Symmetry: C6
Amino acid sequence: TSILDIRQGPKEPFRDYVDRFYKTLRAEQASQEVKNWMTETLLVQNANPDCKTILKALGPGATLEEMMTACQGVGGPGHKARVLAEAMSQV
Amino acid sequence: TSILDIRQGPKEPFRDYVDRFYKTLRAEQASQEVKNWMTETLLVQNANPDCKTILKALGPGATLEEMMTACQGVGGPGHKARVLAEAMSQVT
Amino acid sequence: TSILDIRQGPKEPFRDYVDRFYKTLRAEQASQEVKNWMTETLLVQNANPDCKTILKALGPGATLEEMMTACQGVGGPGHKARVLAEAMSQV
Amino acid sequence: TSILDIRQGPKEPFRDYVDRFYKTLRAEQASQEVKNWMTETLLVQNANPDCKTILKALGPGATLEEMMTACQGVGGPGHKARVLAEAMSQV
Amino acid sequence: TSILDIRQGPKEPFRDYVDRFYKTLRAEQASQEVKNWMTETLLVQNANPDCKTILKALGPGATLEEMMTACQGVGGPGHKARVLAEAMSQVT
Amino acid sequence: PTSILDIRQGPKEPFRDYVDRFYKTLRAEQASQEVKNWMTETLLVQNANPDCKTILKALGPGATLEEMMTACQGVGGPGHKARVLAEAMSQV
């Protein structure tokens, strides 16, 4: 089990995935500075395309509490229809 | 386990999220006065965007009996379909 | 587990919700006359909007066998298609 | 547990509903003659609306293996598409 | 249980259904010859309509490796959408 | 026993999950390490379901694991389905 193998499933909630990332990062023998750097590059990189498109729109300086509120809609009745009703228009 | 970590899943029913919120609130090293203030602030802010839009429409003064009866359709056949319809009308 | 705390989930079938309602009602500490009054009022009130809209059409006098026969379509293919078409043709 | 309570869920496959009916039927206290009359009346009556409109179109005489083959499509990814298409053309 | 009662669920994958079929066939009390005749007739008849439509297009002489590879798309995003289209176009 | 040749991706299974089973199974196969590398290049990309295969077929040769898996973790998601469903109706 290595921190680099943790990826968000295609239908996994972002809350459930952020917990596995931290659950794993508590075992990987490394320095605190490294673990913080890990948290700053892998977390948003290894997210699924749905959450990734939303986390990029926020930009830098966003904390967990700011992402974890912007992604708890992914997979809800509002999202699936907002996206679905767009691909119809886009094509 | 902290009360601030309890969020409503994107597909979780509101009834289940309210249970965890209160299930987690009754074991917090907080005062009774604080736990009431927590209930009023955290409960509605940590709901997913589907329940929130519905709750934010009721306004202040709504009890759990009024909120939960208004959200138990979220994710159901009627609610899902209605949303999709208004998604084709707003964009066409 | 109070009796007033039993509600019908959004995706939960009616058969399953009624089972929990009675499972919990049998454990309540109260009199028989009260328990029957509970069933008459709470059972249809704590139901989700879909089963509720179909129950308010049967009206009063419907039995626990007429209701369940009227709601076991909720959440099925025939139901979902019927609910979706009616909404699309409205806007 | 009584044979008259067994009902097909709104999303339950038809194979898994016939399995519980007979699992329950073999336990009900009655004679074989009464159990054969239960099967002809209850089994089809307690089916959900989707697995019922199909059976009502075979008519009498169709055995179990004749029905189960007619109902194993309900809920498949080709059944919904068919039901959903007629609903639109009806409004 | 008896091999004649093994059917493919409406939402079950073909891969998962061929395992119970063979798992059951290895338990059915018959001769090894009657078992090959079972596999050649029942395995396809007891499949759900979605997979059956794909299998009856290939024809005779197709091996499990060819069938299983042709049905592991049933129930997927591309497959679902592909069926919902021909119906909509060949209807409304 | 399980043969590496029978590990196929379910019609509704995440690529991450199917990859893990492939490697969990390949670690046990009694082949030689030279035969296992050849297995990884042929079977893994061949025994995938049609939804992931069409995308891997686009990456082309020279694609590492970290590149494939990042390309497939969207399959089965809202953005994916809506995009695949939108072209089906457009192609017909």
